[PDB]
Amino acid sequence: MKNMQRNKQVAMGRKKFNMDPKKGIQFLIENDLLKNTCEDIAQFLYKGEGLNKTAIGDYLGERDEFNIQVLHAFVELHEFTDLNLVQALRQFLWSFRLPGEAQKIDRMMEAFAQRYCQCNNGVFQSTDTCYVLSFAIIMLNTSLHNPNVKDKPTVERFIAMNRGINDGGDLPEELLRNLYESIKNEPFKIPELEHHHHHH
Numbered sequence: 001m002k003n004m005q006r007n008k009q010v011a012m013g014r015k016k017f018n019m020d021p022k023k024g025i026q027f028l029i030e031n032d033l034l035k036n037t038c039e040d041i042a043q044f045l046y047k048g049e050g051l052n053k054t055a056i057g058d059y060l061g062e063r064d065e066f067n068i069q070v071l072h073a074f075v076e077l078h079e080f081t082d083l084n085l086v087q088a089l090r091q092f093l094w095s096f097r098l099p100g101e102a103q104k105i106d107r108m109m110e111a112f113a114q115r116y117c118q119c120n121n122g123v124f125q126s127t128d129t130c131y132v133l134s135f136a137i138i139m140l141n142t143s144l145h146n147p148n149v150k151d152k153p154t155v156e157r158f159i160a161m162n163r164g165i166n167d168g169g170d171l172p173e174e175l176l177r178n179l180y181e182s183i184k185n186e187p188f189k190i191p192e193l194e195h196h197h198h199h200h
Contacts, residue, residue, distance in 0.1 A: 009033055014050045021055030024048075038066070042074035057096025061104070071108070075115030082119070085130065086179040089137045093190040109134050125169035132165045138189075140180065145187040147194075155180045 009028065016023030025045055028034035034044060045051070045059065059067050080088040098104065113130030124130040140158060143151035159176050188195075 006033075010049055014048075014052075017048075017052040017055045021052065021058055024051065038069045038073040041070050042077060045070055046074070046077040053095040061096050061098055072111055072115075075111055076118055078116075080116075080119065084179055084182060085124070085134060086137045087182045087186075088116075089134055090141060090183060090186060090189055097191045105138065106135070109138075124171070125166055129166045129169045129171075133162065136161045136165065137180070137183065141183045141187065141189045144183060145189075155184075 009031070013024035013027055016025075016027055025034070025041065028044070029036045029041075034040045045056065047056065060071060078088060078092050080092070093105075109131055113124070113127050113134055117124070117127050117130060120130075124133065136158065140153050143149045143153050145152075155177055158180050159173060162171055162176060
């Protein structure tokens with residue numbers, strides 16, 4: 001029952017963000033409860049233990065000066081080390097909103113695979129494949145289930161892109177069918193989704 005010091009901090013921390021973003025952080029970083037220099041700021045700011053989505057978002061998806069460092073710091077806090085490339089490109093652009101559309105995701109992707117490689121390390125050749133491939137899928141899903149991009153690509157086409165972008169990786173065909181399956185079978189993606197608006 002005796003409320004531990006740490007617990008008391010975690011609570012007050014969430015409150016800050018609720019009133020204003022970057023407040024809960026400065027607290028832990030000011031009280032030594034956290035490690036500044038974009039070290040721990042990643043494991044926390046990136047998500048935290050109940051941080052306001054609107055807050056973390058405003059900090060992730062704009063520009064700033066220090067923020068850019070927080071993102072580059074650690075690129076593996078999207079809970080998908082054992083999930084898969086595609087599956088990651090499905091649900092990983094919410095809780096913040098990416099205003100502008102296809103334009104910033106490019107850079108964010110280069111660094112995405114550049115650090116996320118840890119998830120596999122050797123599976124996607126090195127890193128280039130992980131990046132170039134990632135986008136290939138982001139487009140697939142989009143064109144797949146989109147009103148402004150009514151196309152509905154096929155698994156074959158993907159393989160057509162993989163068999164060349166890999167630069168030698170090749171990647172099992174069966175894997176391409178499963179990785180792409182996560183999409184066709186589990187549509188939806190970047191913000192501004194239908195999310196079943198018909199609900200009257």
